[PDB]
DNA sequence: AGCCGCGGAACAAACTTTTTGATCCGCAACCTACTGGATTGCGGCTCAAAAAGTTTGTTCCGCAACTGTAAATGTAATC
């Protein structure tokens, strides 16, 4: 069905393990705007994986510009 | 490029919890025996009054995603 190359890159990133890679994967498969047909089950899987991969991370302030 | 409801805020009258400045009243002191005058004085206790501390009803401030005819595009990478 010729999944776009950017979609394949995001899937590879999610397989490696990232939280945004699956965020922008359950919002790419849940709407028609991003350019791919909406699949609900395979978007729900990406949403669950994105939420599961958030644990263990620390939120810190990196830089600042006054 | 426009500006939805939501929730803090910047202000501003009302409650509300103490800071202060007298007034009083036992209360031991004199004085002498003891209500000694026709006396003072002195320290807890209480009084509203008012300069301080919340509490609560109103008014603007800000901000997001996308809009009405409208692209599925073999590979990688740029703004």
UniProtKB/Swiss-Prot annotation:
Transmembrane segments: none annotated. It comes from Escherichia coli. This is Retron Ec83 probable ATPase. It comes from the Bacteria. Probable ATPase component of antiviral defense system retron Ec83, composed of a non-coding RNA (ncRNA), a reverse transcriptase (RT), this protein and a putative HNH endonuclease. Expression of retron Ec83 confers protection against bacteriophage T2, T4 and T6. At multiplicity of infection (MOI) of 0.02 cultures slow growth when infected with T4 but do not collapse, at MOI 2 cultures enter growth stasis.
